[model samples]
Target: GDAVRVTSSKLVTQPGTSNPKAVVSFYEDFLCPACGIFERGFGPTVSKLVDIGAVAADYTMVAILDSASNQHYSSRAAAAAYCVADESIEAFRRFHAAMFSKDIQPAELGKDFPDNARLIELAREAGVVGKVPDCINSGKYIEKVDGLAAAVNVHATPTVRVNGTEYEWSTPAAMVAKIKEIVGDVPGIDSAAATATS
Candidate 1:
């Protein structure tokens, strides 16, 4: 079996320590609809898990739908996100949220995706707008995203792997639940539950 690393140095990780109980890899395309659903619904919960030190999430941005969108919206957005991630993980989180929220509307699918100025604005709103636009505008990380996606053999958006094995769920909530189940109950949550029960 030929298995490649789901995590890449080019991506950004969330608030989990090096010793997290579980690690999840999220291979996403920017202009992808299903990816947008995961981003808006389960993405926040995953971030919360990261904050609680229960899980570490690797956001591997990619753009497999370049043909569908001639203007290369997916590629450009992925590059911009990498730039933001390179600047700061916290900022990347915010910027990532913004991108999914604003650009993933039902109407904007292909070339209609947010452009360079919008990406810069999102970074600014995320509070980590340093040298990000320059990197994105220069198309620096595009090749990296494409190369990484090819290396990982990601043929679809919203591809997920839990604990180094590919996992799937019918719904976004189910996906989050599975991830939580993999990480198990956090000590803080258990302690709080016990205290309340007593």
Candidate 2:
């Protein structure tokens, strides 16, 4: 167990809101195809919710799919995410979105998994600077990322939680409905903003 110990706070991204009505958490691996699908489908609504202060989001990146790629892309990408998250939350958000973008996500079992250098480029593209390159190249958080997956008992990607309760993955509309049921009357939930996707 050579895992570097990381504080619990470092494992989670809280979209800094004061007493938000609901807290949502996503346990995902960057290389997960389903995660990309879920993000593409539901990410807009979640972003809207966060923007309007109706809900707080806690994103925990895990590396459960490391075996799928020869270069440990899952761990490396997760660590890169932490690097971005450390410097700027907004940058992390953009990096997170890009990581799961259809074109960016590498095929599982493919040899094209992005290396540290590539991840650093993506970080820069997301507007991150300062220590990210070193962080990714040194594998600074790879062990911590593994430890986080084990600590959370995450055996799969895209495990989601709402208010600490497990939520079954579903379509965007269903997810929106579920959130509404849990956190009644969140502003912008029904607005066009929530439905707009990039």
Candidate 3:
């Protein structure tokens, strides 16, 4: 069942900084367009915030949508990501960005997704093709992704938890507003005015 995590749990061991800070634990579905916005928008914006000294801002991804429609592919794909994350958190982020960059069109969901070969190739581009299909087939990382999401009670895709408060967003702007309210300011943009750029 767990074709996900390849390395030991220590790999995903997010290093502890001065503080735990505020984190936006996210759950997103593969078929949803909102996932696009979060990756495209807040992804970079929030990164800048952290870089600029918003020490508390951090993010995590959960693959809650893959199994909804295409179990064969989504399940494995989700597991693949989890495996990478388990091996290296930064690798997981790189893979995460690559996945969103592909847009994850509805056609890419389920059996429609590429074979393990292509998925492996995709991971290679991001430089994190540590070990996927084998681990996935063996069900390595699957349990980690599932357990983490279950522990967090993630039931929706693209759901953003601002300081542990789940929020529903109809658009990117709305999501940003919620974050602004919670953390005050994102990196480059003015949190109060909701400026587009920082």
Candidate 4:
């Protein structure tokens, strides 16, 4: 079988160690630059927080941000993630990293390529790649992602919520401060910075 090749690096952060009382919600657009920065800048800090039982992470996808032509990327990316997650939850981040590894210029590559070709490649390679031909053909994944996005009230890119608080992200420093304010004295949420790049 041919493996699904991914163009971007989409990384999913698992709920490492979590305080049942604490909840951190993530809302992202698959093609947004700010979401990319959030992944690069604050991903480590959040990962540590989750690692130390400070917060529980949940992801929701917003697809309209990428435009209809490129909309399938986020929607399908999200659907495929869940499909893989169904098999091995960690595959979420592995597949995410691959999907987000590169900037998605779907227009240049042609919209059909990412949703049709690349998705098949990644899905097959990561092992969630499935037999739902119609799901892929009709873009049914968009409905799932859109429903999740609507339920979460994610109207913008990198829209984040930690314990019912929202941060617009002026800077990485600002983000850290905001995290501290909401995620106070949980367990291992003491660090207010992203620790690693990749």
Candidate 5:
């Protein structure tokens, strides 16, 4: 028995301007290196895109690597993130960046995972530490985290969808190029390109 959605369905929402050209959804697993790459490389790039209101981004955290590793890091991390997101979407954004910045090394995936205390520290750093420790300790959102990934049919980490189309991810420029092809140049993309450069 698994919950299909959080009671509040507290998926984090990064607000952009009205009538955004696209909506980007990221199905993320914290333990995956490819997730880290998208976070480290294009996280900021895409943030810039959303910041200018070219798009809105929704993040769903999921855990798929429990059997791959002896530990349950994926779900644990996802639970922590959901907890923060439950508190505040802004905090979730800050905490999300901080978590990805730490970028759990691939070598450690099979052997080590950050403890809830470490997650709390990151939440503190992000200024989104509201009931997060309680949430993580109690696994408040674990079911919701599991349900999100399963419902979305997300079998892979870092699965990104833009406007319901699979947006090919390679380089920042290439992504922007693809976007331009689909939607043509709008104020958002113009500003997004500017931010990607600056």
Candidate 6:
């Protein structure tokens, strides 16, 4: 299949702030365990940063692990995410977080995985409506997902890039520290002096 170019401007979650200090690009696959771990642990911090106008978060959904599930849940979920994002960015945020939640995430290499119908249900759960269901059923973004993933040429899941450079951090605190170093003085976080004195 030919790669379809997926635009990133609309997918960025930058609300109430202009000229953010940093741009964080997150590459993730729904079926990836490591991706889930990162989402579960560091997702909230990213949200806080975006909300405070300190950073803009760009989520790039990929499906390199489509073969891991019997029904290609990775691609389907990635497409569904795009659909939800198209309909409502807020809903997409909820849906994205829910997909990585412990209760909702499915096991890789499992025979049973979420189908299109179930994905639609999830979209609804995320308060998404409109043509999202039709889009998912028709696999509208599947090719785009594949194409974008190929273009990125990422070898692993949960690959994070800050300011166009690949970032590596072991913990949420470390991630925040690294981002602070680059962005300089994230709002709402205590100053070094205050933290050190405490």
Best-fitting candidate, scored by TM-score: 2
- Model 4: lDDT equals 0.55
- Residue-wise C-alpha lDDT for candidate 2, range 1-198, written one tens digit per residue: 112112222122334733445677789898889899988878877777677555667888988888743588898998999988888888888899999998899987788888889999999999987999988888889889978877877788788888778888666666667767766565566762347433
Q: What is the lDDT of residue 177 in candidate 1?
A: 62
For candidate 4, the clash count comes to 22
Q: Tell me model 6's lDDT, rounded to 2 decimals.
A: 0.75
lDDT minimum window of 10 residues, candidate 5: 1-10
Give the clashing residue pairs of candidate 1, or none.
none
For all predicted structures, in order, the TM-scores are 0.78, 0.85, 0.66, 0.66, 0.80, 0.84
Ranking by lDDT: 2, 6, 5, 1, 4, 3
TM-score of predicted model 3? 0.66
On residues 1-198, what C-alpha lDDT tens digit does candidate 6 reach at each position? 121122223223335754445677888999999899889888777666555555667888888888743587888888899899888877888899999999989988767788888999999999987999899988898888877677888768888888789888577666667667766675544442233223
* lDDT (Cα, tens digit) per residue for candidate 3, span 1-198: 122211211111224843333454566644456676567766665444344443233333455655545644544566666656555665766776677665544454435665556666666665765566567657775566556557667666667665567656554455555545655554543542243243
Candidate 5 to truth, TM: 0.80
| Per-residue lDDT value at 7 in model 3 | 25
Model-by-model lDDT, in order?
A: 0.67, 0.76, 0.53, 0.55, 0.69, 0.75
For candidate 5, what's the RMSD? Answer: 5.3
lDDT, candidate 1, at 107: 44
Model 6 stretches astray by more than 4 angstroms: 1-19, 191-198
Best by lDDT: 2
Clashes in each model (backbone N, CA, C under 3 Å)? 0, 0, 12, 22, 0, 0
Which residues of candidate 5, in runs, are more than 4 Å off? 1-19, 67-70, 102-108, 181-184
